[PDB]
């Protein structure tokens, strides 16, 4: 017997069902910002660069939902980390620069990152 009216009431078991129940009550344009899904998810690619590369992808997606032309593919939500105020301190673009890569982190993360610079902006 699953689905609660509450937030919880306690314990890992209730907690595990709860992220399933949350995805129901907001399906809309992926989870966007991953819920209690995040904990199992890292181990799913323990070998080792692939986790960061994946993580980088989600973080880029999350920033904004742009036009979505050829390699401008960022989904998730339109505003939730914006892009580009001129009063924002120390700005969004600092994280965007990582994604522009020569190899600036390692090659698996690099391939993901170049696509990801292209994708947000």
């Amino acid at each position: 017997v699953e689905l609660i009216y509450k937030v919880c009431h306690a314990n890992p078991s209730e907690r595990a069902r709860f992220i399933r129940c949350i995805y129901n009550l907001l399906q809309s344009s992926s989870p966007a910002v991953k819920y209690e899904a995040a904990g199992t998810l890292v181990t799913l690619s323990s070998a080792p660069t692939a986790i960061k590369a994946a993580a980088q992808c989600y973080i880029d997606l999350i920033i904004k939902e742009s036009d979505n032309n050829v390699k401008l593919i960022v989904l998730d939500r339109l505003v939730e980390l914006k892009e580009h105020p001129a009063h924002e301190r120390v700005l969004q673009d600092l994280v965007m620069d990582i994604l522009r890569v020569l190899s600036t982190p390692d090659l698996e993360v690099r391939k993901k990152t170049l696509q990801l610079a292209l994708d947000l902006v």
Binding site: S46, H87, E88, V90, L91
Partner: protein
Amino acid sequence: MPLRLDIKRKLTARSDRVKSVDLHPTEPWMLASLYNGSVCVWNHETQTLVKTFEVCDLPVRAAKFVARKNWVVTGADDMQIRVFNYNTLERVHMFEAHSDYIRCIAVHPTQPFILTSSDDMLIKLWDWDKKWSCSQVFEGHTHYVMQIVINPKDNNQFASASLDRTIKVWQLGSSSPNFTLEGHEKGVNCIDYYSGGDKPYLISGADDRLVKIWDYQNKTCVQTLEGHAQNVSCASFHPELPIIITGSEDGTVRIWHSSTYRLESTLNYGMERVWCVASLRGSNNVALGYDEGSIIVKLGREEPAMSMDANGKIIWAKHSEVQQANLKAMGDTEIKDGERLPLAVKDMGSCEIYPQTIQHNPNGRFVVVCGDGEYIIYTAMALRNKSFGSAQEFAWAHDSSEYAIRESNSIVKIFKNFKEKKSFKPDFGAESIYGGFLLGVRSVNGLAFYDWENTELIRRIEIQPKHIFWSDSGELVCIATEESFFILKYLSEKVLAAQETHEGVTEDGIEDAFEVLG
């Protein structure tokens, strides 16, 4: 002498005598090497034990992480340093580091090297990349090499402490110690450097009850630290804070201010015989090895004290173009919001006390330096002594010519024009204070708001706060709470009838005078 501290027990673990304690070079984990023949590591932030390794069945004196390889080096009474992968859980390598058990290991992240110090009176070098071949052997020490540390200004240099009453500074290139320091008089248990790019320092600890500070640049002994009232097992330098943390076999740890060597604290735990110390290089965690276990402890000062007025005097203490003892700072710069703005400091006159908290007035007329149960008021931009007062805590309110203080008599105090207000004195007790117009005082699992009119209990909110700040109209308040945040309405008229009537209970209040807006 005063210093921002707050000793906190981050994680404890009970085990047979832990000779070495370490923080993981780049990870939030601390590794302790035990006499269980096991080394164990725990990440003392989430309170999860990440992994254990059974190095030997006889004590492991030393353990450290070579973070880049994702490996841990241990040296045990196998007279071996055995290497393991701390995520693929298996023994990476096994090698004989020495002819005797390995007291300490030091890791050079920039080079493939570990040098290990052993009580075969020799320190040997091993290169992890060669599969733990013996790169270099250092012959210099004629006694039991208790500890090794790498100098952070030249990693090619390390110092080793031996119970031979010297700490010898060696270079990798040279088997022999390229110079000797005679750092102690009853053998040197430990050597440490005071970390940084501009700090040439050594420390020696000895069983003459004493820790000694040495300057390696000048070669003189800067001062002698009382250490402990029994043989100093180890001594180390904290990087950020000006203190030395020492441990002794009397089960006591003492903290000494490194500016006059007057006792900052004495800590015992019911674990006793404190063998080692080590400090985190990124600062504010020190870990100490004891007979009955290990502890990882978290030191205070996490955040700076400063305040921005309307005169562009943004005042801090410490920092650049400002001294800690005196007071200064200005910030008149408006360069782009996207980066950190320059210091932009302009000089500011006299001070007489230490700044526990140092703050400008919110509209610029006063400066307050608070410190040692006293507040001293200095004038906004002239810094002549305006006023004085008592304050274990000082907070400007909204009024900022009325302020709240904790005078620590069990009543939260208001001082107005820096002169005490006794028309303000809670019918709660006190345990702590929140500023703003209705002073929040926390007592008996309550937050009580008091009037600056007759000090009656207006209301009590049943979730205690982090803060109360009141708007500059004093009808609206913003409450920082573990709840998250409240905005409350103080209905002024309702308060005037209630307060006069004193229908508001001594410790529970009247639930009408205040109302919960959101």
